[PDB]
Amino acid sequence: HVSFPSTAGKSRVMIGKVEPRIGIDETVPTTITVEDPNEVIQVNFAIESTNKPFQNTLLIGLPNKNLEMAFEPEIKDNGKLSMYKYRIDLAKLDAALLQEASRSPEPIKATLILASSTAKPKENLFREILQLNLNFDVDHSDSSL
Amino acid sequence: ILCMSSPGAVPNTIRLFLNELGIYPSPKGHVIRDYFSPSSEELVVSSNHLLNKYVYNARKSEDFVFGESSAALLENREQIVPILNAPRTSFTESKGKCNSWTSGSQG
Amino acid sequence: MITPLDVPPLDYFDEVFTSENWMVRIYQLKKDDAQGRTLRDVGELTRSSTKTRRSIKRPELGLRV
Numbered sequence: 001h002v003s004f005p006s007t008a009g010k011s012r013v014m015i016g017k018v019e020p021r022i023g024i025d026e027t028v029p030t031t032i033t034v035e036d037p038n039e040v041i042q043v044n045f046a047i048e049s050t051n052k053p054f055q056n057t058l059l060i061g062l063p064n065k066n067l068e069m070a071f072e073p074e075i076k077d078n079g080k081l082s083m084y085k086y087r088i089d090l091a092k093l094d095a096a097l098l099q100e101a102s103r104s105p106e107p108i109k110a111t112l113i114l115a116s117s118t119a120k121p122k123e124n125l126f127r128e129i130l131q132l133n134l135n136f137d138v139d140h141s142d143s144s145l
Numbered sequence: 146i147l148c149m150s151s152p153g154a155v156p157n158t159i160r161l162f163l164n165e166l167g168i169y170p171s172p173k174g175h176v177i178r179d180y181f182s183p184s185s186e187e188l189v190v191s192s193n194h195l196l197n198k199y200v201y202n203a204r205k206s207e208d209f210v211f212g213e214s215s216a217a218l219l220e221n222r223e224q225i226v227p228i229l230n231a232p233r234t235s236f237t238e239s240k241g242k243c244n245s246w247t248s249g250s251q252g
Numbered sequence: 253m254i255t256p257l258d259v260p261p262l263d264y265f266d267e268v269f270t271s272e273n274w275m276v277r278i279y280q281l282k283k284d285d286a287q288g289r290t291l292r293d294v295g296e297l298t299r300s301s302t303k304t305r306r307s308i309k310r311p312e313l314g315l316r317v
Contacts, residue, residue, distance in 0.1 A: 070248035115180040
């Protein structure tokens with residue numbers, strides 16, 4: 001059973017904009033890129049396919065600077081396919097991920113891992129989803145960051 | 146001091162002493178797994194994950210064999226020196242139902 | 253009236269001198285911990301020995317910077 005992926009972005013302030021524009025190593029490439037004009041939840045959809053839906057995680061942050069989180073998904077079984085929705089909040093985000101992004105302009109990248117042991121090499125998913133850009137100046141000038 | 150504690154061979158006094166230092170290793174029964182690895186037999190890590198050139202930075206690329214290994218969480222202390230972290234796609238698997246100890250670069 | 257359960261302990265200062273009639277008391281600020289632990293937690297560590305020290309669970313610490 002393939003999965004339908006979605007990301008509910010429940011920002012509390014100026015969210016920003018997605019940008020899956022640049023081309024990278026296309027390993028199990030993304031079949032769909034979507035969005036939503038909603039107000040409180042700027043949900044995104046990417047109905048892709050993978051091989052092994054055991055290791056399933058959403059790493060959001062800066063890969064080169066080594067500040068990334070780990071978000072588990074919200075699974076739904078209807079009888080058709082899998083429904084994997086991971087709800088990312090803005091406010092609860094770690095302080096460093098906000099302070100660094102605020103001080104240094106770099107797009108917060110999103111990565112999705114779908115994998116397991118049984119699959120053969122290169123059959124599992126590890127790729128770049130989107131790049132959020134921060135807008136609001138909420139960044140304390142004296143913090144442990 | 147030099148300490149070693151692998152899954153299945155982790156003491157309690159060493160774990161407590163490291164907890165007093167701000168280093169929290171995974172307990173017994175928790176192991177590191179990485180599927181996007183060039184090694185299917187054991188755990189292997191390249192020199193890309195070296196984190197301090199004043200301890201060791203390889204003049205040319207290399208990879209280190211680790212096998213069944215563990216990971217630790219660190220605090221924001223001036224005295225802690227991270228040397229080698231877990232691969233980005235790695236994760237902690239527990240035999241029981243324990244929430245994953247670590248995940249990605251935070252191990 | 254003062255009871256030995258009224259006065260809590262000092263974890264950041266050390267008594268170095270008390271006059272003969274207790275009129276003048278001189279304390280000295282202790283040096284900070286080499287490991288970086290708070291002096292409060294060194295004090296608690298000294299004042300507490302429990303067989304079942306605590307559960308396995310996990311720290312609620314934030315992201316390493």
